[PDB]
Amino acid sequence: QFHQEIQSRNMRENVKRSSVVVANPTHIAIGILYKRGETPLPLVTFKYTDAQVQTVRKIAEEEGVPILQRIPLARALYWDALVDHYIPAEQIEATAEVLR
Numbered sequence: 001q002f003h004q005e006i007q008s009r010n011m012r013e014n015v016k017r018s019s020v021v022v023a024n025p026t027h028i029a030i031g032i033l034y035k036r037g038e039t040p041l042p043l044v045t046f047k048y049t050d051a052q053v054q055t056v057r058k059i060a061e062e063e064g065v066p067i068l069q070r071i072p073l074a075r076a077l078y079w080d081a082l083v084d085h086y087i088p089a090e091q092i093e094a095t096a097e098v099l100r
Contacts, residue, residue, distance in 0.1 A: 011052070012059050015063055017031070018046070018065055019032055019065075020067070020068060020098050021060050021065060021067040022069075022077065022098055023053065023068065025049040027051075028047070028048070028049055028053065028075065029046075029056040030047050032045065039086075041086040041092065042099065043084065044082065044084065044085060073095065
């Protein structure tokens with residue numbers, strides 16, 4: 001229960017610190033932060049899969065963080081990006097589109 005609350009918690013903080021979430025593992029949700037002038041490139045804020053994605057979606061809806069179905073991008077960030085790192089160069093244009 002203690003661990004459940006911290007996980008919750010952590011998930012909401014992660015969602016709220018994001019500019020957008022891209023979604024589709026079977027299911028994927030990845031958070032992206034881009035704040036022009038602060039972040040030179042977008043950064044990955046979180047990565048959730050499978051059962052956790054439904055809760056991410058609910059939290060994003062509550063918080064007004066947009067969540068976009070972008071299946072190739074979600075897959076590429078899942079395999080090729082890392083949380084708390086800037087996005088890979090190969091995904092800059094795809095990511096720019098979800099930030100427009």
